[PDB]
Design a protein around this ligand. Structure first.
Ligand SMILES: CCCCCCCCOCCOCCOCCOCCO
Ligand SMILES: CCCCCCCCOCCOCCOCCOCCO
Length: 360
């Protein structure tokens, strides 16, 4: 969602320099004087690459299986009265794109895999005094799932096996291996695609030690989406912002998620306010995988990944400004043993992001 991309999303739940954050922590609403609006997008360009071979001897190599993506974000925030404020946003919190050929040998465990999420958020917060503040949010999730699968060298495998058995010596015995082996890769073995809505509620608590230092604890509820039933995980997060100097600040957060398996994310970053116009941000983060070294899938790319980030912010003048963010993710090369297959998945990625914000 913009600036956050250049800070590796470090302390997203305590930073308040632009309305983007309210969607991450509703309590942060009591942090804005005048209505603020921000919009933009993040262009996502991956590089997932499966490798290795099959017991069929056929290649299980698949270059670039993760498509590019453009992700929009739009946040609006405004005060109501000295003790209340409200806000809305349109973003995306989950997704996933994977595409192999339909003739791929592991076609059964790696056909087409799409999943887009649109989160519609509305929420409010109440300021309890100079220090504490609290927020509650409702969420609308539009999910579009697409899941294709074929039988790669499956019939061959079935067949080669048979050929190692007595039924080998004919009598509808060899005709068998043949019939199995005479099965096309592109023989679609699974096509489920649908659209449905999800509903969840998130909340937050914002504690500030002063206009220069604050901490937080946010909570994101699980969201079940029924088509097959897809569950977006519930989340917990703690973040801190320290305005250590007029020109230097620090932000960091620890996030926890339990996919009813579980994983965590850690990020630390620092911004620098050179002057009234310019602002600079750097960030590092690591998100530990929620999937056991044996329950992975070349289909769903994820794996202990790291993040390097850098963003900049030009303020045209007191009311408006634009954010530009860069972010590179490198992935730990792993070993997957899905089905009768065994692959190897590497994958890095680049993120470009821009956002313009305006005050009324
Ligand atoms: C390799 C993908 C990196 C995912 C991080 C993007 C970070 C920002 O937020 C995105 C939020 O919403 C959904 C993401 O897009 C779908 C995933 O990319 C497709 C590759 O399989
Ligand atoms: C010493 C300066 C670095 C700032 C970190 C202080 C943050 C202290 O710990 C908070 C513990 O709970 C949340 C997350 O972990 C901290 C941030 O990650 C740091 C480097 O990987």
């Amino acid at each position: 969602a913009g600036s956050g991309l250049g800070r590796a999303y470090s302390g997203e739940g305590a930073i308040a320099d632009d309305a983007g954050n309210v969607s991450r922590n509703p309590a942060l609403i009591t942090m804005f004087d005048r209505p603020t609006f921000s919009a933009g997008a993040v262009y996502i360009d991956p590089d997932v690459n499966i490798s290795g071979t099959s017991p069929s001897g056929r290649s299980l190599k698949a270059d670039n299986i993760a498509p590019t993506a453009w992700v929009p974000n739009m946040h609006f925030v405004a005060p109501i009265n000295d003790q209340f404020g409200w806000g809305a946003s349109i973003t995306s919190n989950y997704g996933l794109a994977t595409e192999f050929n339909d003739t791929y040998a592991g076609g059964s465990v790696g056909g087409t895999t799409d999943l887009e999420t649109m989160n519609l958020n509305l929420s409010g917060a109440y300021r309890l005094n100079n220090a504490w503040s609290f927020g509650l949010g409702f969420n609308a999730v539009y999910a579009r799932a697409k899941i294709e699968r074929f039988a790669g060298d499956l019939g061959q495998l079935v067949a080669g096996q048979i050929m190692q058995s007595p039924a080998g010596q004919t009598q509808q015995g060899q005709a068998l291996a043949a019939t199995a082996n005479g099965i096309d890769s592109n023989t679609k073995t699974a096509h489920l695609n649908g659209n449905q809505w999800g509903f969840g509620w998130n909340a937050g608590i914002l504690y500030e030690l002063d206009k220069n230092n604050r901490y937080a604890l946010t909570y994101r509820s699980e969201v079940k989406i029924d088509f097959l039933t897809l569950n977006l995980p519930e989340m917990w997060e703690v973040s801190g912002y320290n305005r250590v100097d007029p020109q230097w600040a620090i932000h960091y957060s620890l996030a926890y998620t339990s996919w009813s398996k579980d994983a965590y994310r850690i990020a630390l970053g620092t911004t620098y306010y050179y002057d009234d116009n310019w602002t600079f941000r750097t960030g590092i983060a690591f998100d530990d995988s929620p999937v056991p070294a044996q329950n992975r899938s070349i289909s769903i790319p994820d794996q202990d990944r790291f993040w390097l980030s850098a963003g900049t912010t030009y303020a045209f003048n007191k009311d408006a400004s634009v954010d530009v963010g860069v972010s590179y993710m490198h992935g730990q090369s792993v070993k997957i043993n899905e089905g009768p297959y065994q692959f190897e998945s590497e994958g890095k990625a680049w993120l470009f992001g821009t956002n313009f914000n305006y005050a009324f």
